[PDB]
Write a protein that binds this DNA or RNA. Sequence first.
DNA 1: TAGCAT
Length: 178
Amino acid sequence: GSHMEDFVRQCFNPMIVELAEKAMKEYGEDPKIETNKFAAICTHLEVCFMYSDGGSKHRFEIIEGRDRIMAWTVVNSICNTTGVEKPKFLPDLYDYKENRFIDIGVTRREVHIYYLEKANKIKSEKTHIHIFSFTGEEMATKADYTLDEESRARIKTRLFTIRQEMASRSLWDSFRQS
DNA sequence: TAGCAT
Ligand SMILES: [Mn+2]
């Protein structure tokens, strides 16, 4: 029974917490033990949903948050109807305005470190990468940041708030260093 | 699978 687990459950809304729990269990893993992975998955979900709220109403197909089988089904429907390349790893959103998949990532390292790791470990060229840090930096493919500044700014604000909440509980050093 | 580790 870790502090980190009880922190996560009062920091994120129940719908995000339930989707996180399902994602770790769908891959046979324990929120109670892998508490840093629990917090990261909740963080990734919250950013993806905040990001999809930033568009015009029909702009994005949400992939993140669905059962894996249904996620790939929706990816195949997009690739078959748009002709866009089928990504190798499950993306987070599909941008109907710019006709591309987006993979969002959140990092406690310098933004470019995770960006470059993603820009290889995913290879599948045409997928747009958008990285956010817990210090208010972002980095996106071709410096194309997809949303208005206000929509990205509220994401950066929320991430710094998660950081301060973890730090005020002495969970940040453990989280940052794991 | 998240993303930090290696
Ligand atoms: Mn992602």
